Symmetry: D2
Subunit: 425 residues, 4 copies
């Protein structure tokens, strides 16, 4: 229909140049796709209530950040319990349940040269309380990441390490840091004090570009909607900053004081949701996909080969979604790195992987709770149907839509190798 091609900035998407793409952006072209950039909300006195946490989950919070610069271990254990209680209050409806990750943001090294003694204790607390992600403060070199990994011990091997780049040395040694990290946070607060404030946008754009090239998550952080700590509506510069972080290629956007201590935590999450959805439709996928493909090296990994084939197929048919089965999140991450317009619906039995895949743009995790079927092919089919039923309930899919289904040839992680074109019935 003609109505379909007028929505989600599709006239601007078909433009032959980036300049013509800008000229065709339309304020009346409504977003249809689900919001793909994850929202990280910092927990604090304004967002610790179990009832308030339920509202923030409904507003779109995907990752709850625990800032270990404030409060004791007892305070953070209560924050974790409250987040889990609010998240699990929706588990009674499996088709709409939204996993929420818990990230531990370290206090940092301070005047020390590396991992502080308080950080070693906090990291151990994180492993004992089952946190999903660590946002490691003031990462300056690859050995800082190795120290965090060692402090997590053998029980914390599955925790994702997102290195925070906060100073000149971190920016200069970025490549070596990214190589050993799971992802990066552009920590603009400290970065804007360590380097001239007028240069922060260059460091942000460079780091986002390099993370997009590497296929690793990147988070944009600090003062994105700062005035909403006290005001019900943000400034024109703040809405612009959120939109531009998404357009730059950020996988996640963050709220700090806006959700930790402000008077509008739910509204700040709703505002980031609304802006991100508009900005995602305005992405010039024609150039972005071409450049990501051209820059990505040749691969003999079947998961990577299936992912690029699936993303190409999704663009060819305007697929509503790519449904992928994943144990660790890796198959969903490899689809996400090619920035499809189609939502990546990731079905997993791992509660931890379901929480962690929020780090990857456009990955919508679905936690499958049913025990395995005796026939493996039936178990695979039941999970694909669960993805379809959840997608229909949530508005991602309708009867008549085309979907790309990504699975593997045997049970266990690492064997994705099949892409299938399915019509929704």
């Amino acid at each position: 229909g003609t109505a379909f091609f007028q929505q989600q900035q599709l006239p601007a998407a078909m433009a032959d140049t980036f300049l013509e793409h800008l000229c065709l952006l339309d304020i009346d072209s409504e977003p249809v796709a689900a919001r793909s950039t994850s929202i990280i909300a910092t927990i604090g006195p304004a967002s610790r209530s179990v009832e308030r946490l339920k509202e923030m989950i409904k507003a779109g919070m995907n990752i709850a950040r625990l800032n270990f610069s404030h409060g004791s271990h007892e305070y953070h254990a209560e924050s974790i319990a409250n987040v889990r209680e609010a998240v699990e209050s929706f588990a009674g409806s499996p088709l709409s349940y939204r996993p929420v990750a818990i990230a531990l943001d370290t206090k940092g090294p301070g005047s020390g040269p590396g991992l502080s003694e308080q950080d070693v204790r906090d990291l151990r607390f994180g492993v004992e309380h089952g946190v999903d992600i660590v946002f490691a403060s003031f990462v300056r070199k690859a050995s800082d990441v190795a120290a965090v990994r060692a402090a997590l011990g053998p029980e914390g091997h599955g925790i994702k390490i997102i290195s925070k780049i906060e100073n000149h040395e971190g920016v200069k040694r970025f490549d070596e840091i990214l190589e050993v990290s799971d992802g990066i946070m552009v920590a603009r607060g400290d970065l804007g004090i360590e380097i001239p404030a007028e240069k922060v946008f260059l460091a942000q754009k460079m780091m986002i570009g390099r993370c997009n090239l590497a296929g690793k998550p990147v988070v944009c952080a600090t003062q994105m909607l700062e005035s909403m700590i006290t005001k019900p509506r943000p400034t024109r510069a703040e809405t612009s900053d959120v939109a531009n972080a998404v357009l730059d290629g950020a996988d996640c956007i963050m709220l700090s004081g806006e959700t930790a201590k402000g008077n509008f935590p739910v509204e700040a999450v709703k505002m980031q949701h609304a802006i991100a959805r508009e900005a995602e439709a305005a992405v010039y996928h024609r150039q972005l996909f071409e450049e990501l493909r051209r820059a990505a090296p040749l691969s003999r990994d079947p998961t990577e080969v299936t992912a690029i084939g699936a993303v190409e197929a999704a663009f060819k048919c305007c697929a509503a979604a790519i449904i992928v089965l994943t144990t660790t999140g890796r198959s969903a991450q490899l689809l996400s790195r090619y920035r499809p317009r189609a939502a990546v619906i990731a079905v997993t039995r791992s509660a931890q992987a379901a929480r962690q895949v929020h780090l990857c743009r456009g990955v919508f995790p679905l936690l499958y709770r049913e025990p395995p079927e005796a026939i493996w092919a039936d178990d695979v089919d039941r999970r694909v149907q669960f993805g379809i039923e959840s997608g229909k309930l949530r508005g991602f899919l309708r009867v008549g839509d085309l979907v790309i289904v990504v699975t593997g040839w045997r049970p266990g992680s690492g064997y994705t190798n099949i892409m299938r074109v399915l019509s929704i019935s």
Copy 2:
């Protein structure tokens, strides 16, 4: 994993160039072709190429399609040519390494305002003798194709009609002719008399471009190696002409007097084979694939969606082949339209489809004759392994190679919707 030697062969340095100009600058006479020759060779049968022993040498030299020119000879003469071609082809059924299907094409005498009485009788002879293709002479409009289609009686609807464009009217009404034809022949002999000789290259390049855009076979014909009718080696202009027809995008190249009446028919076939193999490696796939992708409309047909995903996947891993199961040849034709560097190995139970897919560049037909398995998934797996084992025997594949496999979700033509990445064991 692959080695530096791998990346020096098949013009791979020129393939990785960022511009067409740099691609030309990187072409290397020492970079040897490795892929099997993908442009089919059509040889005209006549006194110099009619004997069974001569036809066996032409099949070994690379002849894929035998052309019967109905402008000369009786029905009895042509029936004997067909019998000799079939005897020569079937003499290799005892060795899978040497057996190759060979299509039989009937080239009509021509028109009068429309279909001549002789053409009606010759087309009826074609249906009765089971020819695979008709090269329809002097097609000037869509109704000329409809007349040929109607003359293929109740038994010949599966015969491919390749319209020969031989005059100004055929060039001017090209779009309406291509729409109703299975493919086109650029009949340069008559075209060069009907329009100024210096304009034939424009008509050739335009028709090849439009056929490539439509995904329909196009044949370049007449005087390609003309001097080889009396000389053992061709001129510099003749080798250039063959290479440029392949670079232009021709699916097939043809020999007329060179094989029908000349003194060196086998050498003419060998020369076209040698040039086509060099020219195919020199194709600038980076721009070709991007432009075919951009110009092809969005599609909701699962065969078309699977085909572009499979070709994208094959480029990502430098796949040795794309193995496709096809009953009519259509799934192989849709892969061929995206011009993959990987060979398209088409496994079919239809002897007719196996001969006809020689019209599509890079399609290597394998005729499967095993009785059908009771469990359909087992019959599919047996055909995929048949394509892998044939590929290993013929030199296309080795253990450790990656192949893309294209199949559908249920039996019957029209359901192709699956692409898998397999590692050869």
Copy 3:
């Protein structure tokens, strides 16, 4: 490397490490982003003009002299507040501060004066107060009018009529502030000299989360049309009370420049804030960094592909001059202009080289601040008897001012743009000159 190897040997590796030149040479936009370097210092003069709103914090002659030194190019008078007497005094103070630097013609910096109208309010068109304010503007010789709440082409015709026959030279910049203005943008731009993306009212008239789409669309269309576009409101808002801006504010300024804005604006930050000079300095610092980060390779290619073929010799000369400047990394393009039009046509192709515009018109010298990368030089000498000698003297004045200000050094290449006869509309010559 082959395309820059000889010039790298000649100009040095240090030259090619500055002004984001490694990012400029990238083959893709993604690689361009990956190569942006916080250690790559800007060298070129700041090309995006700064509009500062005049008020109690920036009205004194001494304060205005510091703002001119900090980088203010256009002084905005907001007619929503203050009487005609108040605004006349602001104009006098701006002119006194500007003319305090006239003693040195080789370094004099012109400053434009813009009148921002109160608006229609609940009315359907031009209000009676706006008619009186526009007449005040003509009588006091303002250079630009920022017309509030422009909704259609007839609104700009009403502003033009209210300026009368004596205000024909004043530039009309239409402020787009509501849904109707965005929807009828093409008809408004066609009859306006330029556009202001008035984000304050726009963010109340349409959903706040859609303002960035309207901003990017309007900037893109103005860049395609070759007409000035201003980004306005809350760019450095927190600087009204704080000495340093937020991370979102610096990002907003940088992104407005990267989007393609010709001008950026300060409202409360300069009119009533505690750090007006620091706010101007911050916009100057961010704009210089962002201008160097522009991906000229794609921008120039797209401006050429989208611009229609032209038989206008000024337009043909402009693209040839910008192409020549990129080929040699020219320090500047020196252009002679009567109305500013030849400089505007060079500016539309977004050269990295500064466009040094030599003019005898004091008004054109102030108005060309609306065009990105145009550095006006007011030539005060009387005409030579031989016209060709007069042209040569003006080109030499541009070279001498360029050397004095640091734009040009001995050994640099400059592109010189002139015409074949006196009078506006005859630019048709491009020359490559080596600075001695």
Copy 4:
């Protein structure tokens, strides 16, 4: 009507594939034929009357093959070429210069042979414009040819013929010291597998286009025309594809030296080249040549790119350039403008030699001098305009780009002007 001619619908296409789809046999060429024709002189093309017909048919360069004939034979060929060329000098606005090229016998089983030293000396003494040096395998072979030409042969252009595997492999070092290259497909097709010659041709043409140096495609282009009045379909395709590849010149050997249809062979190359030049996809070609040409601080190079960009912006009918050595015209030619490059020169030798550069139309200036240098420059520009109008290149209302310098003498081109005709 303007936008339907010279393959302009195909020129405006957004992709190369769409460009091919839009090529039209009814879209007539309008621009003058840009690719020069080299005709080999022999028994079929030696008489003054035959040479006059070949000049009218489009021959730009006369090739003397020193593999056959004595010095006396070649001196007579040169005299006949000059007599035929000068028979048209009475009309200066339409006079067409014709270059004379000496093609050496080669080294045989040997570097520079003793016969080649004598033949090269003969060339200098008889004022030849170009040397086609046979079997060039390395840079020292070019240096030997240059030394054999002596101090009097400094101005002669050396076009190195690449005829074997070593020449192809050491191409970069050969091109660096040569004025241009000839893809000598005859010997190349015997030295390397015949099926690989097209790769060597396309690579050498691409590298010469990148370097901004002339490249000639040679041998068997219209071979069947030695005995037949019309060429084969492969031969017309070969000529068209050499032009599309980027060849500056195309050549005729036996077709003009000994064949029965020498004039018809020249006419056929002219007709094909004109059609192929209009089919060039300038949108991609200019972008790639512009991107790949290095950044430069040479004012002639800077002015040249600015002038070609300006010509494309206004669909300029021509770029008129004043040149002493041909260099300013060569630097414009390297960007492959659609606009004809009309080169006004006083040097008769430079006028003959610029036929090596595609799209350069030499005009030999023989009008009385002006006392004021600026008036003399203006008069040469008006001469280019008047010759252009007479020859059909220009009409009243057209826009032209004019390229001049700031002072007399070679090396000072730095000005580009947009001029409206009449």
